[PDB]
Amino acid sequence: MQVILLDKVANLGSLGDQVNVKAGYARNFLVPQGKAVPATK
Amino acid sequence: SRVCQVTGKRPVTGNNRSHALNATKRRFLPNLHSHRFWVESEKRFVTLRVSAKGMRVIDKKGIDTVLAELRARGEKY
RNA sequence: UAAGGUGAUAUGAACCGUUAUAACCGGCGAUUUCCGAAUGGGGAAACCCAGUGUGUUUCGACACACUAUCAUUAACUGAAUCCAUAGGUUAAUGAGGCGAACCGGGGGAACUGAAACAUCUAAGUACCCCGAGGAAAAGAAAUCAACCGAGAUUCCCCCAG
């Protein structure tokens, strides 16, 4: 899955970029706590 | 019942065909799982009985869209 | 329409009517107890017991109407928590139940044949369930054809055992 980040998650990514992350990771953690949004543009 | 709320998938019936081609009735069941989807538009969690294909559809489309068509279909979530 | 009539077994009694509101026939209305989807609660169907309001009042009491559930919407309310949300109350609209076949879909046998039997057949038949209509379904090419062209769907006859 592709996510547009909204924060600096000290694991892997910085703000405002599209990054390939596990679908479950994005669905359960990133999206539900801000941090990221899906890459729909 | 075992019906995927998002996609409408429901159990179908086929045959167990043995090696000797003996056929016995069987049911294929969807891969349903009760999942708690988070909605930004309400700040709330929506629990749906959705198969894995349905969860993929959720990721592809969006939770708001799928609830929009769920309400259009009239099923209460 | 009318000189006869008050259904039949079923005769009698008491009457009605004769030129026109007797009787009969048709259209439209009126009444239409109780049970039954039964719908106020309940129940061993044709029974038992209520609540609310209005109106009758000599306390007794009587009458009328409403009061089911689900879905839809709206209004007003309203938790865990602030806001909301779930829920709650009220109102409007719709549905339920029944019915012979036909029709669409969801499931779906076995006896039988195979000269036994398991692939197969019987047969997607019997049956069960759901839904709709006077018909239903299908239907307007991501189709056939064979480089010639046809031109949505349905049904009948050949093709063709």
Next chain:
RNA sequence: AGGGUGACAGCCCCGUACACAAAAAUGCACAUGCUGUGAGCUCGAUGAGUAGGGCGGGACACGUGGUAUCCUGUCUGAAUA
């Protein structure tokens, strides 16, 4: 045509052929007004968890067979004129 009438009736009766008949309600064909309904013209758009695939099954006359095509339970997954 038919039925009845004390036996078998064209002319005894009821009917029939034919000619008519509706105050009221109605179905249907058509018309006129109407209420929310909408044509045509130009430019664009032109259906994505989708086709296809893997695994299982079913329907296609077609029993996996060299098996096309459709539908899918599961896992994936485009191009978009």
Next chain:
RNA sequence: UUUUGUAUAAUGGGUCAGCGACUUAUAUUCUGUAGCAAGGUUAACCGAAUAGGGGAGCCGAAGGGAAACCGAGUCUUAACUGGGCGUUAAGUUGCAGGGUAUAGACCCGAAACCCGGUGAUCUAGCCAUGGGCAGGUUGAAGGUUGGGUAACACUAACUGGAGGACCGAACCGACUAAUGUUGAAAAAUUAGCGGAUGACUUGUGGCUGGGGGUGAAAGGCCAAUCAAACCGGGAGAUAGCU
């Protein structure tokens, strides 16, 4: 009727009257007959509708070969002296018939299988709530008062009233015998017989259901039906058998 063979003491029928068994549909072949004849004939459908139209199509007039293909020939083979199949009638459409095929297919007849329901008013078990058990015996634990003991232990009397205890009516059963065996009764009667305060019995209501229930177990019981209930349907199952 069935048989090698029946008066057979092998089967069937008490008698009469009525009903009762080779049919229908569609294909295919042969025969007869009728029309037309290298032609014959239409099917759906249209139709003032048993006419007429409709020739789509089917059969036939050409066969050989697996096939391309060849063609009164063709195939085999490198090729036939060859050899196989063919070449010198006439078919076709009705009508009637004899067969065949698919249908319940001459009629009656299974035991069984599957599907959907109806049954726990009998019986099996359980659950809830009520009831019954005359009368008479036996005499456990325990207690009391003594003896006893260092205290117990133990011992005697009185008391006590246990027990799937005893004898025996109601109640429940059913061991023997006789009767009966078209019975008084589709399991009873008479004389005895077993339990009879319990793992008892019983009234009322409820629950469990068919490949399932329930079973102190017999394949027992599940409405006089049980090695898989009953009713309806598949169904006119199939029957090389009578």
Next chain:
RNA sequence: GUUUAUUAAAAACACAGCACUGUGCAAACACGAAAGUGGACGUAUACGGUGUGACGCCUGCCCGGUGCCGGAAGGUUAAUU
């Protein structure tokens, strides 16, 4: 005590007792496509299954075969790639 209602009441079944065995609780196990329910508002001195069947004296040898338990090295082994 129970049993073949309706030809068998027994030496059959049950029984208290004994043993093996499963089960740590959302227990095993059973009914149920599932929810759930019983087990049990119990918890290993409990519950299920199997066999033997009061009591007394006992219950000897065999683990090759079939099961069950334990082991993971090696061989052979599916889907998938």
Next chain:
RNA sequence: UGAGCCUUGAUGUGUAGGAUAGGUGGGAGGCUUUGAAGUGUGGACGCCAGUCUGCAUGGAGCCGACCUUGAAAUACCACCCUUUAAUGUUUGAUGUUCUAACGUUGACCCGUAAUCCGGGUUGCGGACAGUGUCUGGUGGGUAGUUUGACUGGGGCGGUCU
């Protein structure tokens, strides 16, 4: 922790052989001013013969075939071999922590007069468990069936061309 990725170190002495060789050497110079001969980590390989690493005190020569060998010396020389450092690099696996999916037949609060259910707070477990598809094993728990004929009746025996 196991496949590939600056691997610059990548061995490799049947037979001989100062001389640890599969062969193309760029078939003969490299070389000298990154400094040629106590290398002030030392092993990797060590059959231990020596290929042999920032450490060069020496700041410039050891050295090439040449001699023995079935080639001729990997002298700045491109694919050097059942080993590893490789910049880690993409990845299976295992193990260990986490919490955010999921479980909760833990507690409490709310709908709500309700040991159902749902919502919230929280505790625990936690990517396990559990379910779906595919797949191997077991599977008389259950189901459909098979289990020949002759025959001096059938069985047993014998036979079947």
Next chain:
RNA sequence: GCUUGACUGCGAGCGUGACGGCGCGAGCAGGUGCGAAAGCAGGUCAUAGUGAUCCGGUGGUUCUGAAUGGAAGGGCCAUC
């Protein structure tokens, strides 16, 4: 001693079977072996030594090869 007739395509006419099938066979065509030659040779002195069909496998064959060219497949021939 030499050899491959334990040949290829047919086959008049028979025999034997319900049939499937089985057997005997001169002669013809091609090409061979032996013999100087006539001639003999398509197995063994004869009668047993075996199984139909389907489904497939292998090699030939361009016979077909669903729009066309191929190919897959199928057919025919040999064979398991």
